[PDB]
Design a protein around this ligand. Sequence first.
Ligand code: SF4
Ligand code: SF4
Ligand code: SF4
Lengths: 55, 96, 70, 264, 176, 155, 53, 318
Amino acid sequence: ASATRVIQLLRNWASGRDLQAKLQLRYQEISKRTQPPPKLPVGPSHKLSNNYYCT
Amino acid sequence: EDNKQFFGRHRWVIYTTEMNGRDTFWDVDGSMVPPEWHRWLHCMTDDPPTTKPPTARKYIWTNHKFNVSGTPQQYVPYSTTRKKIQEWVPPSTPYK
Amino acid sequence: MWFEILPGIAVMAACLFIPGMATAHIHKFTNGGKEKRVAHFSYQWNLMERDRCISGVNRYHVTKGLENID
Amino acid sequence: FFWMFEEREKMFEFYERVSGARMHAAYIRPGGVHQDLPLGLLDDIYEFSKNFSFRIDELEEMLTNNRIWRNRTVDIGVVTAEDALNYGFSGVMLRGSGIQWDLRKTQPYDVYDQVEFDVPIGSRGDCYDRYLCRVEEMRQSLRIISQCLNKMPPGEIKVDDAKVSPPKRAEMKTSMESLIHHFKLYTEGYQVPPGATYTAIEAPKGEFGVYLVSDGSSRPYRCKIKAPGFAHLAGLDKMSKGHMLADVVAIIGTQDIVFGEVDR
Amino acid sequence: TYKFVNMREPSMDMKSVTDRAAQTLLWTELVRGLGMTLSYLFREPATINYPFEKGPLSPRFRGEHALRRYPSGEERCIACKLCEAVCPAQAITIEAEPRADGSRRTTRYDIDMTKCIYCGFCQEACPVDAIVEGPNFEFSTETHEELLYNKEKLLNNGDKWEAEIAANIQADYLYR
Amino acid sequence: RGEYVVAKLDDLVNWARRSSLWPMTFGLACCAVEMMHMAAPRYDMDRFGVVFRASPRQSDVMIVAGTLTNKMAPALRKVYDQMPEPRYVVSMGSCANGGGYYHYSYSVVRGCDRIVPVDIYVPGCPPTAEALLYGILQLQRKIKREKRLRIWYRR
Amino acid sequence: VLRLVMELSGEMVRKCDPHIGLLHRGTEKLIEYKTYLQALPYFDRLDYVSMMC
Amino acid sequence: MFMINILSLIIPILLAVAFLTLVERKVLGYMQLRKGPNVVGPYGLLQPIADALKLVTKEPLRPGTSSISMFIIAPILGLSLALTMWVPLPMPYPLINMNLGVLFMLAMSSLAVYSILWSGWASNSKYALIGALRAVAQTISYEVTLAIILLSVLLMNGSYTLSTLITTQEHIWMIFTSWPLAMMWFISTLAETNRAPFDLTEGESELVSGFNVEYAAGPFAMFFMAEYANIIMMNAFTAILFLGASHDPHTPELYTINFVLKTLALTITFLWIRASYPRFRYDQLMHLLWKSFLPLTLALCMWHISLPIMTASIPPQS
Ligand code: SF4
Ligand code: SF4
Ligand code: SF4
């Protein structure tokens, strides 16, 4: 779906930890969904010579 | 859209009060999202159709249709093939 | 977003609220503004009966002071 | 349930982003995975892995030291270490009792050998020890995730040999050999040399195996499924021999028996 | 390597026994969980407002099958029947024919959605990217016959979800 | 005339039914796990008045979640036959809708419809949680368009 | 899906008898009619909590 | 206007029970990261109305293998006792000043067994017949602890007049004197109302529901009404018994507000406990009270009867 500091200190003390370091939420830190076109690499046997399938 | 919210509540839709006859004011489903905005809704992209004009072409529909199941505009399956072995037409001249 | 629960119990509070003053007010309403005279022992009942008899209106919570007597 | 199921949904998002469906990927095919990951997937995995331990321990604190979670579960239905392995038990069922055995280390398939990790080994062989083993397996899983995330090499996704894996779409539409190979691969498929194998891996339930015997054609001859839950349910009678009904339902929990693989 | 999970036996000094007796009598771990759940009560609720807001997806999402067509408007399907030979559930059926123009299009092309298992094998099998799976998942129907698609229904699906499929393919063809 | 009063009354009744349908879970395969994800925090079925947990005696809708085998069929039949009216049964997943991956099996019925009436056909393998939820919403709109007392008054 | 025909002197369970087959699909019969490439998704739908495993 | 006061007691308790079925589904969900019902009206305020209408117009199935007499009487007993057991509560001016109000209400608290047994047996199902005896044993075995706790607490109050209990507390919260006792009492309350940590009757693996299995629609909803009315009633009992409040006779509303706030807090603690804890096992369930709770309760009662004597602080009888 951040909160008030009064509630922020209440949940942390009840949870006994500093949860603001990482919440179960996920804010703007996520990876962008419009990544540039990736140029994928090739495999080992991509040469045009000495690629005899027999060997 | 609100860029501050969580990734999944950062964008939303207020649906139309009316779409192709039906008055969808008080009740509405997720089927009146036109495809151009469908990708933007489901985070398939970060580009709204206003900023990202879909490539227009002749055969694309000019009016989105929600799921027409239930209403008499629903789809019914039917064989889309021609006829198999065809019957022999009897003659019309008399027996003699 | 705990405040969404706040309407939910609020009416609930009101739901438990009403039996509070309703019994409290009606007593005050019935007993001439005074609260109900609880009779937990027979002496209290005798006092209430003598008050009812002295009132002359068959209403115990009606009370008359020295102005009633000589 | 719900607290960790939100994270499970976050996993389903990755599943969707790699293969195309959030549950049934059809990703890992013979000759390597189907296609490469989308850009930015690694970063999101990194953030999730950072955030996960703070809720793994959170689940622990609710269950581990709780009085009634232990009392309902501690030392109910003991399984003897000797009697465990004869019963065909596997996975955490073995590790809960105390045998130091794990296919990820002893018989390392793929690159599991280069990955450093400890296994949780049980103490009393009871329900509670197995549950703790599952949680410590969560944490060691997070450590393994970090290790593989940091050291993924540059290379292709499928075996370069096109006769077993479909060619890339570029050479499909430009090269004769790729077109014919794809046509036959999706028409006939890679004919497998005749032979029988029993391949076993450390599935999270337990050791999961396939007895695949192929006659020597485009089709298999017989595949048999060793599911970790079958021998488990076979031994489930000896598993509970005097404990209450609430105990048998506490048993089928760390028995972790999904009825999709035992039943086949 | 391995780690023993539960061998941490307790000590027996006066302090440790007093602490354990207090924890057993004055319920503490009980209160620990009772306070953790409180922390989760005051947190931000994870909930997406359907259908106003939809779940995040990916360009590879596998959904309703559809038959695309070339920019000229001609359908891409040349009826090679590769997709029929690929579908593990055999949900695809084609009958081909030499058309009036000549191009070998399908007289019949039906996908049994109730037999389909939504794998994406057909699209990766297609050598002309004719059959594809659109991003739509909002086609829950009322009658079983409604699910059994036809060639015309597939063409209409490809003509409704078309900007979607074109944009997704443009963002995914490099991966595949 | 009577249509006004009877329509308002039955509109009230069908709204009450629509916003308080109680699923009878009934998960047979991976469709069960996807439904469980659909009741997870993210989509939160319980928000819409649906309660997911329901004994078959107190329930309104059955979700046939997964493949239905021959050995199962009598049990599902006895479960539905005991289900109090109204009882709308939704079939989720290609397997439950008809056949499935294991369409041509020997111990799997080729569709829940051959066993029990299906009110909403939900496709997917598995139907992604929100698709299930949309099927539930479609059933809700179906309950909205319910004219029981209208037909009684106009029989 | 599950069936436990249990025999119990009240509480301590004497002898259980699980009845698997309540979700029986002929997958092991189904494999040897499709190619391996077509046989893959069966395993995906086999243990549906550990798909990729 | 006496009957008007009665109705002003029943009806608001009915709305309170109705909206408890909403506040629980909201509190639980928020405790487990769920927004809860907020679609039926604003913030789900209208949701209890819809489910109530559905259950009223749901078909009530007659159990074919049953005698209808008890199938109808058991909801009557469970519901009517639950409501009439609200009668002697010290609102600032309690409705009925029964000289033995606490004993009156404790005696009526035992009557829920007399709905449980007929529901479990008359419906004539395995789950019903099991759960009837199991739940009966639960509630009867915790009623004793409730009894000694009530007696030991009252030994400092003065009498069984439940209106004077306020006069007992006045200065300090009574829990400050009997926090070891209340900690048991509250938990035993949790046991008597059959709540998730101590329910044991639902047990949705081997008992499913236990008593409300074959009950459908209306008679089924009546037992829920009894169950979620006992929640409020016993939380209110505990609230006055231990969490005292001020009461100025010239301003009755003050104690009313304080008391309803205490009741809401305690009910929220009920929901709080159920949303977190696992469920007991019958073995441990009766082990908890027979082995552990009862000896401590006996010793505490001995302590609390000896204490007023040695301190020369016996409470006033009248
Ligand atoms: S996803 Fe397409 S190719 Fe695969 S089984 Fe379903 S219809 Fe056939
Ligand atoms: S694989 Fe593509 S071109 Fe070949 S028949 Fe199928 S849809 Fe047509
Ligand atoms: S339709 Fe797909 S997800 Fe559902 S049970 Fe069948 S194989 Fe599993």
